[PDB]
Amino acid sequence: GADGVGNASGNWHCDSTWLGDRVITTSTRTWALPTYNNHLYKQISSETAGSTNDNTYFGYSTPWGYFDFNRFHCHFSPRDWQRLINNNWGFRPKKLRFKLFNIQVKEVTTNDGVTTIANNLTSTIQVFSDSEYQLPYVLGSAHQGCLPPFPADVFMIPQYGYLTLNNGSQSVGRSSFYCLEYFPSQMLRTGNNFEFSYSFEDVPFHSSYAHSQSLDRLMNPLIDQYLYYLARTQSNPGGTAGNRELQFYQGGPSTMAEQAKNWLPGPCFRQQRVSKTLDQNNNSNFAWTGATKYHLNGRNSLVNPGVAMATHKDDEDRFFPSSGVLIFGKTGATNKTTLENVLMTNEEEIRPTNPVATEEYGIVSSNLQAANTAAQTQVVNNQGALPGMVWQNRDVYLQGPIWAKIPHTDGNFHPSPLMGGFGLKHPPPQILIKNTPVPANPPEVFTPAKFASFITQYSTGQVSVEIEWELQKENSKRWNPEIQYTSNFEKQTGVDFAVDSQGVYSEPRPIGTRYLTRNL
Amino acid sequence: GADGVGNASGNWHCDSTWLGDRVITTSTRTWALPTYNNHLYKQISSETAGSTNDNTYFGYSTPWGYFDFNRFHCHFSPRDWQRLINNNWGFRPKKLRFKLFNIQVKEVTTNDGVTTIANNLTSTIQVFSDSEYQLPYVLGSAHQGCLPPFPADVFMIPQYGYLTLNNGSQSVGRSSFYCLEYFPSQMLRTGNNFEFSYSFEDVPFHSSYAHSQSLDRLMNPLIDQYLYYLARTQSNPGGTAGNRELQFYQGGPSTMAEQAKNWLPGPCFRQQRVSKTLDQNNNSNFAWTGATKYHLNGRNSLVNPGVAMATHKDDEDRFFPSSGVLIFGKTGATNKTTLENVLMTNEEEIRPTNPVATEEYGIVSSNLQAANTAAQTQVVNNQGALPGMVWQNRDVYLQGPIWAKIPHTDGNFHPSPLMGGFGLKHPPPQILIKNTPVPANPPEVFTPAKFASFITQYSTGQVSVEIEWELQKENSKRWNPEIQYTSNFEKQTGVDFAVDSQGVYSEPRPIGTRYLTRNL
Amino acid sequence: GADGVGNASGNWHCDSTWLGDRVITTSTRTWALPTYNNHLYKQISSETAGSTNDNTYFGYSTPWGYFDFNRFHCHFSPRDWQRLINNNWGFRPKKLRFKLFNIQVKEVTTNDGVTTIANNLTSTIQVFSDSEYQLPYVLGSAHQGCLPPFPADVFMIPQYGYLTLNNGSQSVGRSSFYCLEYFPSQMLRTGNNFEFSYSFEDVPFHSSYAHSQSLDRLMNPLIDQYLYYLARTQSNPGGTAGNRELQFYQGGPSTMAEQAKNWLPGPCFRQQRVSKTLDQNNNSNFAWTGATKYHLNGRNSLVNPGVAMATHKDDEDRFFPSSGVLIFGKTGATNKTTLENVLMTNEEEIRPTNPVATEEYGIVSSNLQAANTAAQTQVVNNQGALPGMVWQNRDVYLQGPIWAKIPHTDGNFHPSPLMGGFGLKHPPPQILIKNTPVPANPPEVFTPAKFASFITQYSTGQVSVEIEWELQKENSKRWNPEIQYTSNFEKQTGVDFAVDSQGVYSEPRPIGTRYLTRNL
């Protein structure tokens, strides 16, 4: 930064600019940063609370905080989100610009029950972004602490901490320890400000479209194929006795199912089906026991949300995959709630290309039939990738994560975040912030020991983030109208996506991007 | 077009030019276009014939016709096909040029049983190609209606129609309706002609070679490995009692199966085995019941032909996969025939890299053995892709489809048409053609109602299509002779791939591209 | 036109181009033109059918036809209409381009019950547009005969005819007679084509927005005015006796109605209220008797639809103004139908600025009160314009008229078509078309008499019209989502705005432009 105490270090700019094929969404917020761990790095482990072999962990908690803006509703208003999803077949991020400014560091003293807060003008904060991706990257794990959806809210910066390898609650030899004061970081007083600019690597557009066709129906309904299939292994029964014969027909309008096809549905990893009407569910706890989960190094980790698959079948609304959806809270919901409080997203738009998450991929022959032996088949619950598969990624939601970091590995298959958004090798850097320690008066005779005695203080200020988004226009020749995301129209006690009488902003429903349709 | 009634709008050119590494195959045909649906767009659905939940559909039938040239024998004579497959390791399309010309529109009137046909000189046809891929793409579904194999035949243009999303026999909200008079289309009288040129996107060469080695045999037979494997978990029995011991040998000439390898066979999705000798098949109808089929949105769709896999084992000719082959008709075969009438293709050339379609991929251990517990394994009927798999695509046949359109999706795995040919994001555009309506005399007092009264008329003309193909030469150092595609040699009542006494052209057998061999 | 018989005189182009702030909508149709009045100009009058003093008329019917493209659905598909109304605050026409081409003139002869139709190559049609507005302008009267909504339909050109001044069924001295062969007109054979280009005069954008505020509520709810009003003419009663006093309060949050305001609702001309539930209506025929109608030269003409006013009150959906709405037919509705067959439009979006069509404008004091005299007031059913009135024009609908011609008069007040659309001093010219007479063989000895003997013939061809529209973008800062025009979403037997099984295109509902909101 440049000037001194009585000069503001940056303006409030929160806006959205729709120009041509791009949109630039700027958002500004006010934040508050406490002092974490009394300026201490501490190791954390599951030893303190026994938990279970699956939940064991080992790691470190740091005094540093961090800035999270990895949810769309940070950058989008409900109206701006509506322009996007109604008018466009896809979008991707292009550029990023981050700013801290108008920094204030307060000192707080407690005497005789009365708490007093005063400006500390000479105290600093430390801020650095990790550009080289050297620290553990905890973004993209869909935690709390992101900038709020509503510009008028004030949010508290979350604490930074990370996990590493472990054996039980202990640490193995490969466990890493990172001191974050071992990086260069800019130190800022009230006149100083912080900024950096970032540029997204090239990624495919998100698909904001739903298919208007299905794989199995891509044919011409009027015309008959020139390819035979095997229709019958017996002669047409007259009610007397079946006689062995091989009969071949041509796929045609009459029978589409038997007709030949070039393509196959996407892969599935199956999951249990749960009903929203309680009396239709089994009486037992199958949530963890009957769960679909993957086994890694003796740990069973639930598969959530998992491979993208349609949530329910054509006519069945009430069923949902046990682990196979994203679930959001309604406003004023605790960390433990019932079905009425949650907001539950479903992917019904991927039914054309994708299996239903709660049902089989297909069925496959298990044996070699003969004259005495009868044909047997087995059900395919899980299927990996086969040549000729097509699928869709999970949808992105106004409340959902924007990106996640692709791990650094020898290989990956079609990397995309299974929660949603844009897989990135070099995602937006983590921004880390801390209150610099201010010692309380030292003893006046030299002792080597650690101080532990500090002035309790916190800092506040504003942060603005600006992302440039690229749009993919809708080319469709469809005659009839599209589906659109609309407002309620009929009267109601309060406006959706607006504050109530008490001042509490709320988002009544999740909103996905897939409305406009295109051919498959 | 340019000139008037009595001037021909284009020459007949049907030929093939083999030059260097390319071949240019031009083919001309004569066509006839009727009037479909009495100039009406009509919705079609399975409601009219109940069928079954798997065969339900919803869609639209259009007055428009379309040109199909998506089979090799359109562009290739049996001799030209023989030069290709004997001399070359691969081929791919490069350029495309399409022409309509010599257009004639006849009016037909029926009085007192006598049908009279006359030229209508002022009537037009409408032709447009969809360059932007905005309409449902029904090509690549292997329907009839393509240009005939034999240049002297006349073919009738098929009717255009498409399917969209449905719930049962009804339409959901995403069902699309396309009016094809909502595109710009060129209107042509007898002097006018139509042309456009297309350029194929870059695709890999088809493999016209068969491997001369197998994955498991890629080793050196003379030399012994330096890698141990676990040969025995007991001591060599003397006929007294087995004793626990671990014994390691080196893979060598003696035991190749136990020897270590870098690669794995391609993925499989298994299918039932059917015998061409009727008495060896089970007595039951397993065709649909014992079928291998995939489940998509509550519909069971047969998997045909499916993932490329060898049709039968080494010595077993008579068995074939239930759904796992392409099947062609002999001349004069109905839409329902027995085994003698069909022409059945097999892939035996992919036995080196690919599983047998009718048998297991492998076997895998199902449990953790201990002192009391005995080792158990389970059979792998289906396998998705694993690191280190190699496979071959299904072969292309003189009768088979050339290309198919890769769907527009977020992801796909090794897209290739499972029927065969070249997967294309931007395939050759659909060419759509229609007879422009000519109204019968109007009533002479104004009524708003739809006419429904038209002059019955049809159009004929010639169409030529020219594709430029790129060739991949045979580099082999193989000493001994290759296998080749040869003619019969011995006498027979009639020439193969030639007309009979009655004038009916016929193709006696399917012909694939894989003859010449190369190392694996 | 240029070339001869066997060369098409123009291409089919039907499309829509959305570029920046403009949209260019081209539409092509096929038409059929009969021979009207056996080539005769005939006078028409109400003398033939007595009717009533209000319905008397005098005029002329002409052999000429005319082209009508004065409805939006000619130029807009239901999807293109949806892009417009969802994304924009207004639109107006800019340019116009009209084309006739591919002309065909058929001769038709009837012998012994068999009707024969043949091309007549040397026969012509006559086409002229009236650029100087010299003929009676019958467009904008919302008649039938316009190009159909659906491009695949064929329409018959309506007959041209006009009315002039009359006394009863007779003609006064100012009655005008127009011969349309007294204008220059282009004569076209099958090779010839017709074209002209037109440019709309500058008009205000249509308002495609609904107001998000009302006139009476424009104030600040939190703050109290500095202006007093007279609250009470008696002292606050204690239950004993009222005492004369004058008391003044300040308009504030509590009482908004009494608060001072700068503006007034638009003018009203009142109309009767009819309920869609039959049992709530009076039992009588009040349709014509209780109608709202204006009296001009001894004729009572119904006021339809009339001055723009909200159709119903806030909570009352079922009521509608007797004459005060536009009413459309469902497909397959006769010229006499019941309530179920009609499609009825309502303006609820003008409730903020406009009176309810079925209720009073206001109430006004009728007398000078004194000590003995009590205050009296009268209801205002009709109100002309007052200083400080604001209002909204009636909405435009996909089925409704685009423009109407402002009469040429000494004065007008806020000219806009009361049906809807754009008032134009110089609207798009009338295009007039006729089949040129071809005489049957003359008698071979000279007679002066009129022929009356002609070859019966008709003509067909294609017509394309292209309008360039200018758009007004949506600038709103509104946080929450807008209302949008959406598709059905839930399943149904057939797609809306699409053909049925029989081929009949239908529009299920009327669609207005007002969805997006802006402040008042």
Author numbering:
A (entry chain L), B (entry chain B), C (entry chain C): 218 to 737
Paper text:
AAV7 belongs to clade D and is closest related to the clade E members AAV8 and AAV10 based on VP1 or VP3 amino acid sequence ranging from 85 to 88% aa sequence identity. Compared to AAV8, the AAV7 VP showed different surface loop conformations in VR-I (1 aa deletion), VR-IV (1 aa insertion), and VR-VII (1 aa deletion), respectively. In fact, these AAV7 loops are unique among all the available AAV serotype capsid structures. AAV7’s VR-VII is the shortest loop among all AAV serotypes with a 1 aa deletion compared to AAV1-AAV4, and AAV6-AAV13 and a 4 aa deletion compared to AAV5. Greater structural variability between AAV7 and AAV2 was seen in VR-I, VR-IV, and VR-VII due to single aa insertions (VR-I and VR-IV) or a single aa deletion (VR-VII). The only exception was the apex of surface loop VR-IV in AAV7, where aa 455–458 (GGTAG) were disordered, preventing the reliable placement of main- and side-chain residues. The glycines on both sides of the apex likely confer the flexibility of this loop and thus the cause of the lack of structural order. While the VP structures of empty and full capsids were largely identical, some alternative side-chain orientations, e.g., histidine 230 (AAV7 numbering), were observed. In the AAV serotype structures determined in this study, the histidine side chain preferred the “left” orientation in full capsids. In contrast, both orientations are equally adopted in empty capsids, except for AAV12, where the right orientation appears to be favored.
Adeno-associated viruses (AAV) are single-stranded DNA packaging viruses of the Parvoviridae and belong to the genus Dependoparvovirus. The virions of the AAVs are composed of non-enveloped capsids with T = 1 icosahedral symmetry and diameters of ≈260 Å. They are assembled from 60 viral proteins (VPs): VP1 (≈82 kDa), VP2 (≈73 kDa), and VP3 (≈61 kDa) in an approximate 1:1:10 ratio. In this study, the structures of the AAV7, AAV11, AAV12, and AAV13 capsids were determined by cryo-EM in an effort to complete the panel of available structures for the defined AAV serotypes.
